[PDB]
Every structure is written in C-alpha cells, then in structure tokens.
Design an enzyme around this catalytic site. Structure first.
Site, PDB file in Angstrom:
ATOM      1  N   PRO A 249      -2.970  -7.720   6.075  1.00  0.00           N
ATOM      2  CA  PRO A 249      -1.957  -6.637   6.019  1.00  0.00           C
ATOM      3  C   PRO A 249      -2.380  -5.342   6.715  1.00  0.00           C
ATOM      4  O   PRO A 249      -1.690  -4.335   6.599  1.00  0.00           O
ATOM      5  CB  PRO A 249      -1.853  -6.353   4.519  1.00  0.00           C
ATOM      6  CG  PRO A 249      -3.257  -6.558   4.031  1.00  0.00           C
ATOM      7  CD  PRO A 249      -3.794  -7.744   4.843  1.00  0.00           C
TER       8      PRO A 249
ATOM      9  N   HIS B 114      -3.911   0.003   5.639  1.00  0.00           N
ATOM     10  CA  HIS B 114      -3.054  -1.058   5.107  1.00  0.00           C
ATOM     11  C   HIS B 114      -1.630  -0.750   5.571  1.00  0.00           C
ATOM     12  O   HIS B 114      -1.127   0.324   5.293  1.00  0.00           O
ATOM     13  CB  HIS B 114      -3.122  -1.056   3.574  1.00  0.00           C
ATOM     14  CG  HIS B 114      -2.536  -2.271   2.940  1.00  0.00           C
ATOM     15  ND1 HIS B 114      -1.191  -2.557   2.981  1.00  0.00           N
ATOM     16  CD2 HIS B 114      -3.110  -3.258   2.209  1.00  0.00           C
ATOM     17  CE1 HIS B 114      -0.962  -3.688   2.343  1.00  0.00           C
ATOM     18  NE2 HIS B 114      -2.107  -4.119   1.842  1.00  0.00           N
ATOM     19  N   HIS B 115      -0.992  -1.674   6.277  1.00  0.00           N
ATOM     20  CA  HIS B 115       0.347  -1.428   6.817  1.00  0.00           C
ATOM     21  C   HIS B 115       1.426  -1.230   5.714  1.00  0.00           C
ATOM     22  O   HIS B 115       2.508  -0.668   5.986  1.00  0.00           O
ATOM     23  CB  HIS B 115       0.762  -2.573   7.755  1.00  0.00           C
ATOM     24  CG  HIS B 115       1.767  -2.182   8.798  1.00  0.00           C
ATOM     25  ND1 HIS B 115       2.688  -1.169   8.614  1.00  0.00           N
ATOM     26  CD2 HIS B 115       2.017  -2.697  10.029  1.00  0.00           C
ATOM     27  CE1 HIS B 115       3.442  -1.066   9.695  1.00  0.00           C
ATOM     28  NE2 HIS B 115       3.050  -1.974  10.570  1.00  0.00           N
ATOM     29  N   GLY B 116       1.152  -1.718   4.498  1.00  0.00           N
ATOM     30  CA  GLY B 116       2.029  -1.490   3.345  1.00  0.00           C
ATOM     31  C   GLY B 116       2.223  -0.015   3.027  1.00  0.00           C
ATOM     32  O   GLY B 116       3.270   0.378   2.510  1.00  0.00           O
TER      33      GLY B 116
END
Lengths: 214, 193, 193
Positions: free
Chosen positions: A25, A193-195
C-alpha cells in the site's frame, strides 16, 4: 498523544479501504528542493546544515495533518498530535551510525539547541537499531525517520517494507546539496502509506519543505 | 468487458519465457520515471485555449495504444490477454474514464464533455501538476501485480532551457522490457515536444 | 564451491543488528538511482576504438568487488555468505558471464573474446543505452529478496556541459547502507571520470 479516528466519518474512509488489502500500500517518491537560504543561514550562524533541513522536514510533517496518520500496533487508524524525528547519526568513518530521537519544537532555536545536545550525547558505540525497536516496543509510531547521505546525489531511493499493512511510520532520505543552474538543490525521497497520503499532500509537503529552505 | 481483446496462445507467444520467468515473483513489477520535452504542446494548448492536461493524457494513451506490449494483461482467471485498444482512467478527485480515439480532436472533444459532466483494458494516469519528481514507485495490489499499468505525471519544469515533465509508470516486467519503455517515452515526447 | 566464500557467523558479525533488523521484512530491499559522470571514459573508449559499455560495466564490477558489503549474499539454505570475489552477468539477448580481473585491460580483452563467442557470486547489469531515465526500481523474486544485486544502466546525457549516465540498483538493506551506496557511486564515477 493521539486520537483514535472514527472511520465512518473521516474524509479518507474510502481512500484507506481501497488500499486495506494491498500487498504493498506504500508509495515512494523522490523530488528536489532549493535549500540555498538555509545553507547560507547555517554557514553564517556556524550551525549544522543537517539540522536545518531536518527541522524543515519535521515541521512539514507536523503541519500537514495527513502525515500524522498511523496504523497503530493494534491495527487501528490513529492521528498523533505531534510527530518527532528518528535519524541514523553516523558515529564512525566506516559508516556506523546510531539511530536516535529528536523532539519537535515549533521554534527553530529551541529545536536546534535540543538537537545539538542530543548529538553531543550520542554514544561512541551502540546498537544501530535500538531506538527504532524501542519505539516499536513502546507502540509509539508518532514519528518519521530521515537518513542523510550528504555525499550522494540520487534521483531515486525506494523504502523497505516491514509488513503487509506497510511500515510503522514514513521513511525519508536526504541527499547531497548541489548547484544546479546556479541554485543549491538537494534530493529528498520518502515512503508513505497511500491510504493516508495522495499526490496532492506530497505536493504540499515538498512545497512546504522548500519554503523553509529558500 | 464488452472489450475487443484476445486470449493469448501462450505456447506460440514470443514472450512465453520472459513472462514465465516472472510468474512466481513476490513482485514482478518495475517502476520507471523519465522526462519528456513538452514545450510544443504547452504552446499549442495555449494557442487553442485548450487543457494542457488533455494533451499529455492523450500523448500517453496514444503511445500505449501504439505499442502492443502495453496492452497485455492478466485477466481475473490468471490468463494472459491482449487488448486491441486501451482507454484511460484519471482522477480528475473523481476517477473518470476516457475512451481512446485515433484522432486527437475527437479525443479532446469527448474528453472535455466527459469532464464537464474484469475490464483491465485500461491504464491509469494520476497528475500532480504542482509537484516535480525524479521518481515515483507505485503500489502493488496483489502478488501477480496490479490489474493494469499505473502512471504518474508531474510538474512541467524548465530544465537547461527546455520545458520537460516527469512521467513515472509501474508495469509488469513479464510484458515489457527496456526496449519497449524507450519506445513509449519517445512516442510520448514526439507528440508533446 | 569452488568459490572462495565465507559462511558468516552472524552473532559475531559487525552487521548482526543491521541484518537482523531487515531479515524478516516483507521487502528488505531498496532501489536507488544516481547519475555518474562518464565523459572521460566515453572519450578514452572512443580514442582506443573500444566498447564504452565495457568501460562502465567494468567500473561497476570493480566498485562492487572493492566494497565488501556488495559481496554478501543469502545462500539457498538462508545462510549469509560473503564471496571473496564477484563476477558480472549482462544480457548481450544472451545473459553472459564476465569474470572479474583487477586489471582493466585484462578484463577488457577477456570480455571482448567472451562476447565474440546456487552461485550468487554475481551482480547483473542490464544496459539500455538509448533509454534515458531518472529512476528504475527493480523486481523482487522472493520475500528474502533477489539472489544478487540487479542493476540498470541508461543513456549517457549531457547535463550542464558534463556527460552523465544513470545507474539504478536494487540491494538488501541488511548488507548495504546509504554510506556504502555513496561509496559505490563515488568509485564508479572516479573510474569513468
């Protein structure tokens, strides 16, 4: 000191759930910032240029709230009030370093002088990863980590990945400051973290770091 | 679906060994970032009162359509498929779909109307026009890789007197080598410079 | 075997805590790209009717040989091994072995002849001399990482009057830090001028 985030509210509910089951992610990015100003100021004040850009980076992470979001040890999304710095301080000429913690202060002089005392107190020998394993043992992910390679200009560094949900905190790399078309620039890589973070927040991060460095 | 597409005859496939090499890798993807001259397109878009974004979106989409290797996918059943044609996804954020047209002006017209408002026959480009970068490396959904290529476009910058912009992409290495990457960037630049 | 190599005693190794930190990671590797000046070598290769490819191939192999951290591998049984010496693989595609020699002219001579025709004591460099890039990140075969360092060399390009070229590489962070990467690129550039 942190808040457990109510996932049902929270504007990034859907952004975060998209990446929830991803093998990786994370994204890494490298960009370049002007830093001629901070280099002059450091030289004039007889100060460490390292601590000037370390501050710039730490301040940007504190000031953009998306960079304060973490997946805590229990797997819950949390937002830390404040983010401090881990950094691997080189202790020997063969590359040995000792990682240590620097507290954030909103006033540069305060940050600077506490930083300096910490560096002067650094042990002659030591476990290079003790500080990181301590923060993991503590469950304190309210940190970022920056590793300097002041003698290397790079166009890319990607981060390692500990586990499936991603690293516990953002990992950064700073490289050599170099004259390009008459201006002093240095590279800064990071793994997030792309979240929690999109291109848009990365844009503001780098804009913000460069503004401090001038 | 309802996409053109061909199930690949693996045994007569020219990249059989290339693909099989990578098939059990934890991470079979590579990421590449390069930069392309884009001053001509900046100028054409300015003259026409057009979106610069749609010029380079199209440049990218056309290149991937003109290099077959950029159109190979792994379907939901794990079979290699070639798509005849590939459309564009882009977060405008709301992720919106842009059909490919051979004709820039048609493409442009349809894209503007769309903006005003297991299909893997796609690529996705994400634009950050305010962020220059020398590298982006993308996410990986699953072991076999992302369903389709993920690209990032960044800030157009004057570098030694020439307008250039960075384009990063993450692709599956079983489909694409350095030769194809080089043809891709060359084609994007030919449309933009 | 019959390689000159050492099974590392991890408990007494100067990198015990470094290696032990990374060794259980999903991804213990890192990718780096940096540019090296190479005007001198391009010139010297031209003047002597030699392959420029082989000059930078040699600079890379020599740098890896001289920095012991670039010679640590994880053997098939999961044990850390240090190779006294390391050779070069390069897709020429035939992936071909080039034995290291301390002397450039000797290395050159043997390499030219070779081209005209669980061992992890190797690095592999893939050259794409017509591909300019600012970043390549490599693949990952297994959880413990690739068997040996993978490198990519790109197009030689003039930047502010100096010929430079990008060299990307993927390494195990258990074996190699930024310090050693900085030294690696310094040695490569020192040879290429």
């Amino acid at each position: 000191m942190k808040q457990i985030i109510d996932i049902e509210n929270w504007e990034r509910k859907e952004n975060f759930n998209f990446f929830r089951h991803f093998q990786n992610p994370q994204l890494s990015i490298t960009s370049e910032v002007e830093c001629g100003g901070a280099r002059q100021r450091a030289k004039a004040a007889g100060q460490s240029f390292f601590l000037h850009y370390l501050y710039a980076v730490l301040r940007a992470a504190n000031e953009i709230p998306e960079f304060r979001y973490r997946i805590d040890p229990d797997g819950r999304v949390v937002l830390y009030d404040t983010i401090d710095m881990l950094s691997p301080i080189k202790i020997k000429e063969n590359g040995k370093f000792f990682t240590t913690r620097f507290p954030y202060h909103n006033d540069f002089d305060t940050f600077y002088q506490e930083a300096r005392l910490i560096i002067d107190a650094i042990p002659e020998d030591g476990d290079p990863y003790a500080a990181e394993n301590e923060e993991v043992a503590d469950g304190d992910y309210g940190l970022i980590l920056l590793s300097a390679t002041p003698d290397l200009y790079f166009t890319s560094i990607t981060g390692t990945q500990e586990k499936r949900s991603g690293n516990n905190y953002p990992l950064l790399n700073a490289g050599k400051a170099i004259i390009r078309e008459g201006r002093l620039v240095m590279p800064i890589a990071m793994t997030i973290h792309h979240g929690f973070i999109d291109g848009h927040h990365l844009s503001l991060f780098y804009k913000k770091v460069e503004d401090f460095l001038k």
